[PDB]
Amino acid sequence: INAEKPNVRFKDMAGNEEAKEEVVEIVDFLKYPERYANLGAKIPKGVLLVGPPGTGKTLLAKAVAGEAHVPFFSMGGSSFIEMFVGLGASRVRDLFETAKKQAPSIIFIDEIDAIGKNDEREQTLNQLLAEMDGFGSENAPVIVLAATNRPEILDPALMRPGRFDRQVLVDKPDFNGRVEILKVHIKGVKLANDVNLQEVAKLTAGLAGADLANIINEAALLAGRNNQKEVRQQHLKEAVERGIAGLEK
Numbered sequence: 001i002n003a004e005k006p007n008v009r010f011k012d013m014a015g016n017e018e019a020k021e022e023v024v025e026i027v028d029f030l031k032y033p034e035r036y037a038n039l040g041a042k043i044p045k046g047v048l049l050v051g052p053p054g055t056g057k058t059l060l061a062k063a064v065a066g067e068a069h070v071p072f073f074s075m076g077g078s079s080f081i082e083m084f085v086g087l088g089a090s091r092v093r094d095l096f097e098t099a100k101k102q103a104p105s106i107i108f109i110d111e112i113d114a115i116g117k118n119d120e121r122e123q124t125l126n127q128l129l130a131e132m133d134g135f136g137s138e139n140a141p142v143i144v145l146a147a148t149n150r151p152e153i154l155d156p157a158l159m160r161p162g163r164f165d166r167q168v169l170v171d172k173p174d175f176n177g178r179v180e181i182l183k184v185h186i187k188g189v190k191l192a193n194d195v196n197l198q199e200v201a202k203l204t205a206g207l208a209g210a211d212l213a214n215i216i217n218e219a220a221l222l223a224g225r226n227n228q229k230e231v232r233q234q235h236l237k238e239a240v241e242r243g244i245a246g247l248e249k
């Protein structure tokens, strides 16, 4: 129904050490929440996340949850754009319902700029700003975390203080970004002794990170595919073949 404790922890993410400093507070907010209540603070209620596709926006959210040991709740970004005029947006009115009971906890809204621009479609929106303003208790600490691609078209309303009042920007890894991921995801794979990792970090430039992680696997299956038992630098090179976003008309 509604519960999924994450086992991710900050390490699982490579690069972005600044990006994550920016969410360290969020963890101390869920770990020792009484320390601010017994002192009269006002824990923010929702941090935004902005970068290109497959880069940690989700992973980082889950890391936070995970370090804090607090439940994590997902929100189908593209799920509330395939409904009709009737049965909808109540998954919002219940997502917090379950969050508030097992609080401290965390809502994650991947692709918020998918429902943050008929009797729709601001149906799912307008009702987000409801459960996120109030409503019946201030005591239990629940932090929504949303992610977005183009925060340019991001609905102006959502950054009005009390909602997504701050953000944490994080984009494509640099070169040393690429090496760290590449290194992260290399673990567990048999390797070739002729694997110039830096080399791939270099044929790979302006690539997401999810993609890197993928490249490593496309490599490795291509391996087992022709039976070879190494995963040679040739294979990695041979991968980076999926590094083709293709035509989309």
Ligand SMILES: Nc1ncnc2c1ncn2[C@@H]1O[C@H](COP(=O)(O)OP(=O)(O)O)[C@@H](O)[C@H]1O
Pocket: 012, 013, 014, 015, 016, 052, 053, 054, 055, 056, 057, 058, 059, 110, 147, 180, 181, 184, 208, 209, 210, 211, 213
């Ligand atoms: N810095 C990173 N270190 C390790 N893996 C990463 C990193 N960034 C992205 N990934 C990989 O990308 C995949 C998920 O993409 P995600 O970041 O969840 O999407 P988005 O960034 O669009 O929310 C994860 O399985 C993760 O392994």
